[PDB]
Write a protein that binds this ligand. Structure first.
Ligand SMILES: Nc1ncnc2c1ncn2[C@@H]1O[C@H](COP(=O)(O)OP(=O)(O)O)[C@@H](O)[C@H]1O
Ligand SMILES: Nc1ncnc2c1ncn2[C@@H]1O[C@H](COP(=O)(O)OP(=O)(O)O)[C@@H](O)[C@H]1O
Lengths: 321, 321
């Protein structure tokens, strides 16, 4: 998988030379977004899809929130270089042009766009039943960040404060594991802690644009990480310094998954475990950062960056990543 | 499909207000690219996939050129608003992380990027065997066009000259019809004019960046159209005026399709029929435009813009669209 993707990554890096010294000259690949040089500012560009969450949407017949998921997966990544999201295009590859599905998808696209402050400006619709067994929804978003205001993680230093913003639930990663582990055994109508299994699996991804844009315009921020594939391992994309953290108690769908045989260390590498976005700020800014974020969503002081390198210590679970 | 898509298009237009008076304010949806206002210039944004051509690549086990198709589909669209292509991201949704397929895909991605002059700056790889029966490749491209230099088609006038640039072959539209009509009847190893059927169906899409950028910097240009889905109907996106055209002889794979019973009026709405890109220039510029374009590829004087509003007359075939 990494082996396969490395072939494309290598080729993409070779193509950087084609814009060397020209408008659009890129930074490196591998971060939450690509940065393209437009002189006084960078354009930030990112691409992501919903994933197999859309199979749960199709199973129950509820498509009016997967547009929120797709917008969230893109605009939340733009935030992680310090960019203001501006615009998005969607790529909708479908087995058939079902009018009711499209109507529902459009509802969630509007709600997500309004929350993120972005215009949906175009896209592609491909009807290909020979290739697509469902309704696959992906997109590409662009944002803007002033030169000198990019937030890469390079400024993260030992001692910095690490703050987590609560997720809304499972978001859009780990659904293949959750689907296969739980649906055949329990049924989509199984009730767990007051919600049906499909409600746990379909709850739309949280959009962090409003709290994060307020944060970065108020306090010094050293790193921003959207918690997606790889779970807490995404922190290692920002820095090689270590982390010492306390994570929230395991609740909801995450507890059901854990009780069905997924060990905790694997959980923290797959699921967001209740924290959808992590910010790293100088310890001098910690109280104000917590104050700002908490006005939008439940937020937690998780811990600190350490001089110890490359380790993520989840102290209250006794787990090291 | 149109009634399904209408729901998403209506929502998209509703989100335009979210950037009203701000950086990134968009133009209207429906053209070959979205235009976003960045002050002195517009960013142009387009999204497109290869389509079921990838099933022919998978059938024969050759993905070495599908990346060219995806880059061409996107950069050729950017040209139609007058934009210089800058950068692209790819969306690769796959049934399995096949290292051989990915290495092959990477080869054509590099070749296409170099011919178009774009950097591949990022993307998304989604391994989703329950959702994808093959290797679906799409992407999003961005380009730049100066204010006052956008080519929308609004300048097209009756009497303007219409020039076609030859296609390389089938390009990336009509493959569903061609696959289902020809492959079971003839076999992928069927030889027609010295090429196997799979060679006809897999021939990579032509990239028009170099001829068109030279053209728009040399002569007055009123309209530019990449001949994709809908075939000649794409001309109607540029203008409400009519067209009087003579199309080239029906050759190669298009002749084989025609000889298997598809009517010509449908074929001119599905296939490019030998013309992959059409330019509309004032009559006074016709000879210079032909000289510039013909340096790069075989090009044709097709005909003229007329006052027969909304009609495309292919006079040498007796067809009206
Ligand atoms: N098919 C691809 N082509 C080019 N770059 C890719 C592709 N898939 C992933 N990438 C790059 O790899 C990095 C990680 O991607 P991904 O695993 O989707 O995580 P994220 O969405 O958090 O960046 C990103 O910088 C992305 O642009
Ligand atoms: N899923 C979608 N979301 C938003 N806009 C779309 C979508 N599908 C198509 N469009 C818009 O409709 C127009 C026609 O698109 P398409 O049929 O792909 O033709 P082309 O690729 O030649 O533009 C384009 O402006 C495109 O941006």
């Amino acid at each position: 998988t990494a082996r396969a993707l490395r072939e494309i990554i290598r080729t993409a890096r070779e193509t950087f030379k084609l814009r060397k010294g020209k408008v659009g000259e890129p930074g490196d690949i591998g971060h939450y977004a690509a940065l393209l040089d437009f002189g006084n500012f960078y354009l930030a560009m990112t691409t992501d899809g919903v994933g197999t969450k859309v199979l749960v949407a199709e199973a129950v017949g509820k498509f009016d929130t997967i547009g929120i998921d797709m917008i969230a997966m893109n605009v939340n990544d733009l935030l992680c270089v310090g960019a203001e999201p501006l615009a998005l295009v969607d790529y909708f590859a479908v087995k058939e042009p079902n009018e009711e599905v499209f109507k529902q998808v459009a509802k969630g696209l509007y709600k997500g766009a309004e929350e993120a402050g972005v215009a949906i400006v175009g896209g592609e619709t491909a009807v290909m039943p020979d290739l697509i067994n469902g309704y696959d929804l992906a997109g590409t978003a662009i944002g803007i960040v002033e030169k000198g205001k990019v937030i890469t993680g390079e400024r993260i230093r030992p001692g910095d404060s690490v703050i987590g913003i609560s997720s809304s639930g499972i978001h859009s990663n780990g659904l293949t594991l959750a689907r296969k582990l739980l649906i055949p055994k329990y049924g989509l109508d199984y009730e767990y802690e007051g919600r049906k299994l499909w409600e746990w699996l379909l709850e739309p991804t949280r959009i962090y644009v409003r709290p994060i844009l307020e944060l970065i315009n108020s306090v010094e921020v050293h790193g921003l990480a959207h918690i997606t594939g790889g779970g807490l391992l995404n922190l290692k994309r920002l820095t090689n310094y270590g982390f010492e953290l306390e994570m929230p108690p395991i609740e909801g769908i995450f507890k059901l998954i854990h009780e069905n045989g997924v060990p905790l260390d694997e959980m923290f590498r797959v699921f967001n475990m209740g924290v959808g976005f992590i910010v790293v700020v100088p310890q001098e800014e910690k109280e104000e950062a917590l104050e700002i974020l908490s006005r939008h969503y439940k937020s937690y002081e998780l811990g600190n960056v350490t001089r110890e390198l490359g380790k993520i210590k989840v102290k209250n679970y006794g787990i090291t990543l």
